[PDB]
Amino acid sequence: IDIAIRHVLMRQGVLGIKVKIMKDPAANRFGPRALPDAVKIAEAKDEDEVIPAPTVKS
């Protein structure tokens, strides 16, 4: 989060503004690249076929 507060001069008084903008965590290159609770699960490598008992000699 980066913020910038400015008071734009009006003839009637003070108008204060706040702008709060977030770079995407995936777009970060310096600090963390995600949220602390962001848990990313890898996919299963299973569902292969195993044959009883051969021997492979290269």
> C-alpha angle with apex 48: 46 to 49, nearest 5 degrees?
150
The distance of closest approach from Cβ of residue 57 to RNA in the complex, given in angstroms and rounded to an integer, is: 39
Nearest to RNA of 11, 45 (CB atom) = 11
Closest CA to 1 of 13, 18, 14, 15: 18
The distance of closest approach from Cβ of residue 46 to RNA in the complex, given in angstroms and rounded to an integer, is: 23
Would you count residue 50 as binding RNA (CB under 7 A)? Answer: no
Closest CA to 23 of 41, 2, 39: 2
Q: Which residues bind RNA (CB under 7 A)?
A: 5, 7, 11-18, 35-37
